[PDB]
Design a protein around this ligand. Structure first.
Ligand SMILES: O=C(O)c1ncc(O)nc1C(=O)O
Length: 437
């Protein structure tokens, strides 16, 4: 397969549904490279657990943890890392309120080259245990010979775009990694980088980040097709922010308009949102505790009940993961019969203005609160017009492995979106428990 798109291993499914999945121990194995140093970009960290996932012979190699924690949270993280002399920390600046460092990325420097891993999991045991999570694995990037002058750039501009994402941190520990990336050849990269960094962007810079970055890529590198209005948009996520009093405020105005973009020319397009119902969570491998990682609050949800009529159940028979609650986030543009897709995005970004950006100042400025990161699969980048959808995720290699079932299934009348801070005591979960916050 050319896509190098993986799910994490799930404890409790039959072996055929973990054949070709990746645990973090697999990613860090000596089989992937002889580790020299690594950078772990993430949101939440269990440092004791994390070091144990490295092979014993690599556990004293330098590790950089890139996080966004402040005040007591920051002190807690520093206390976690203090027993390991080889661990340094980089506090990503979050100068806009309510933003987080949400990017999930590994930079893996080997003796043999460099690897980039962009994924969706926190660095804690539960995120790699029984959740549905996504991974993109870069090729092994070789080092450019000293004295050789070449770009090492890909047709997707991935090398420059990754350096640009890192330069936004303005951080000395990350300038070191930028110099490492400069010294490697990334030209085989066939995915486009889509990042979010905190800021207020106008003019040219508007297209650099968030949903405007997505729009620009789709404008420039996808083509429109007859009856494009009939190709739905699908968004699939594990948290929802405050989107406004009705769908015109953000979801169907600027967000959907970016996601609908195809080609360069100038809406009844169906919008399917996939987010676990209470029943999905109750019957899950984890039971109600899976809802600890689905942080939709009642205070947000009660102000936007209009949104829930967009919601579809989590279903993943194709990958044996209907009971492994989603922590992956994905966005895509399937054909009206869901047999093809025009593009697929895997990312850390949930369905929030903080992650994707919201227009300000009479539509001239895109404001983003958070760090986010994903990779975009475009048919043009593989010499194709569209991707066919792989029928069984783990079963002509140029079909894209969509990890959940199509078409998505609308909530039933008695279904409700998972809301983590109200009790569920009508029926017990797979471990025999109720949910009482
Ligand atoms: O996983 C979590 O618990 C989580 N919590 C809050 C947030 O904004 N995002 C996430 C995520 O990683 O999806």
């Amino acid at each position: 397969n050319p896509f190098q798109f993986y799910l994490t291993r799930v404890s409790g499914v039959k072996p055929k549904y973990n054949s070709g999945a990746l645990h973090i121990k697999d990613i860090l194995s000596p089989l992937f490279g002889t580790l020299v140093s690594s950078a772990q970009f993430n949101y939440c960290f269990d440092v004791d657990w994390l070091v144990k996932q490295y092979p014993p012979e690599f556990r004293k190699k330098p590790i950089l943890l890139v996080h966004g924690d402040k005040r007591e949270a920051k002190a807690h993280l520093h206390a976690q890392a203090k027993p390991y002399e080889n661990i340094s920390l980089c506090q990503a600046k979050l100068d806009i309120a309510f933003g987080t460092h949400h990017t999930k990325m590994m930079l893996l420097l080997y003796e043999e080259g460099l690897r980039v891993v962009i994924h969706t999991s926190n660095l804690i045991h539960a995120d790699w245990h029984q959740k549905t999570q996504g991974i993109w694995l870069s090729p092994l990037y070789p080092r450019i010979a000293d004295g050789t002058h070449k770009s090492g750039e890909s047709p997707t501009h991935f090398k420059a775009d990754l350096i640009s994402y890192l330069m936004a941190y303005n951080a000395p520990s990350l300038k070191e990694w930028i110099d490492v990336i400069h010294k490697h050849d990334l030209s085989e990269t066939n995915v486009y980088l889509i990042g979010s960094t905190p800021g207020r962007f106008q003019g040219s810079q508007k297209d650099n980040w968030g949903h405007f970055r997505l729009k620009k890529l789709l404008k420039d590198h996808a083509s429109s097709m007859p009856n494009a209005e009939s190709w739905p948009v699908v968004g699939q996520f594990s948290s929802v922010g405050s989107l406004g009093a009705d769908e015109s405020k953000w979801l169907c105005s600027e967000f959907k308009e970016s996601m609908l973009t195809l080609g360069k020319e100038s809406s009844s397009v169906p919008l399917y949102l996939i987010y676990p119902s209470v029943e999905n969570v109750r019957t899950s491998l984890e039971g109600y505790p899976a809802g600890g990682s689905l942080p939709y609050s009642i205070q947000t949800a009660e102000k936007q009940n209009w949104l829930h009529s967009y919601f579809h159940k989590w279903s993943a028979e194709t990958s044996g993961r209907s009971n492994a609650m989603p922590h992956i986030k994905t966005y895509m543009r399937p054909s009206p019969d869901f047999s093809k897709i025009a593009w697929f995005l895997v990312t850390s970004a949930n369905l929030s203005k903080a992650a994707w950006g919201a227009l300000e100042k009479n539509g001239t400025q895109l404001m983003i609160r958070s760090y986010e990161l994903g990779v975009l699969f475009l048919p043009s980048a593989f010499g194709l017009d569209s991707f066919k959808v792989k029928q069984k995720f783990f079963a002509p290699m140029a079909t894209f492995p969509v990890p959940y079932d199509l078409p998505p299934e609308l909530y039933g009348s008695k279904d409700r979106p998972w809301i983590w801070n109200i009790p569920y005591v009508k029926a017990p979960d797979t471990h025999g428990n109720m949910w009482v916050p």
